[PDB]
Amino acid sequence: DTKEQRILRYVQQNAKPGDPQSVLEAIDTYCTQKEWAMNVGDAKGQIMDAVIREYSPSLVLELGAYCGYSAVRMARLLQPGARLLTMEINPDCAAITQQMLNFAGLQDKVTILNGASQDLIPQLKKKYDVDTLDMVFLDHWKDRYLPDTLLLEKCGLLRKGTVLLADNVIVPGTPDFLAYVRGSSSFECTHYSSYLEYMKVVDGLEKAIYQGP
Ligand SMILES: O=C(NC/C=C/[C@H]1O[C@@H](n2cnc3cncnc32)[C@H](O)[C@@H]1O)c1cc([N+](=O)[O-])cc(O)c1O
Numbered sequence: 253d254t255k256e257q258r259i260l261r262y263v264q265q266n267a268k269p270g271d272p273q274s275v276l277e278a279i280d281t282y283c284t285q286k287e288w289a290m291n292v293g294d295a296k297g298q299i300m301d302a303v304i305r306e307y308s309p310s311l312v313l314e315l316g317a318y319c320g321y322s323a324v325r326m327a328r329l330l331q332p333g334a335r336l337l338t339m340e341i342n343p344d345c346a347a348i349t350q351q352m353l354n355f356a357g358l359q360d361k362v363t364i365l366n367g368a369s370q371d372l373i374p375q376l377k378k379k380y381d382v383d384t385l386d387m388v389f390l391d392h393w394k395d396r397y398l399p400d401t402l403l404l405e406k407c408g409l410l411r412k413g414t415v416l417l418a419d420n421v422i423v424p425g426t427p428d429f430l431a432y433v434r435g436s437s438s439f440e441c442t443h444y445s446s447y448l449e450y451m452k453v454v455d456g457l458e459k460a461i462y463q464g465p
């Protein structure tokens with residue numbers, strides 16, 4: 253049994269099927285109360301929601317599905333006909349994400365790609381009928397944000413106005429990517445300050461009274 257299976261099972265047992273908000277809330281409860289996990293969480297999630305609603309993207313690419321928290325978050329706000337493509341290297345995580353999406357009733361909007369982003373990005377146009385992307389959500393390994401951004405550019409997947417939205421630019425941090433985009437005339441950058449997910453960390457004191465030998 254893995255933490256990620258435990259999260260999925262908690263969702264199946266407690267959330268309302270076909271209700272994306274309920275699925276988000278079950279994940280957040282479980283991770284707040286039982287086991288920390290690297291989902292973006294509700295605080296940053298609300299910022300995500302505001303951005304997605306502003307731009308109304310027709311085609312979104314996610315790097316790093318994990319358990320599908322952000323895929324549910326994003327897909328539930330997509331208009332009819334819009335698509336989310338989400339890349340996940342770990343087959344266990346890809347399976348969990350697909351089940352999470354199924355449970356939420358969002359499976360028709362989302363396509364899961366099993367593989368490493370560096371290998372899949374060059375296949376997007378031919379295999380998945382993609383011209384350019386409207387939005388990219390980066391939340392995979394932090395050292396991959398910059399190499400994959402350069403690869404997206406190389407592969408012709410970016411157009412004027414494509415929105416990159418990157419998690420964790422403060423903690424754990426993505427310093428090369430952040431410096432790059434902030435210094436490049438090819439990008440206009442805005443920072444949205446928030447809070448790291450699930451940080452009400454329990455600790456305690458132990459009192460141990462010696463009784464003699
Ligand atoms: O490390 C974090 N995220 C990495 C996310 C990784 C997820 O993306 C997949 N992946 C990785 N490169 C990939 C390339 N291609 C496809 N999937 C890939 C991994 O298999 C995992 O499912 C993180 C850590 C903390 N934290 O506080 O420690 C907080 C956060 O919010 C985080 O996002």
Ligand SMILES: [Mg+2]
Nearest residue numbers: 292391419420
């Ligand atoms: Mg993250």
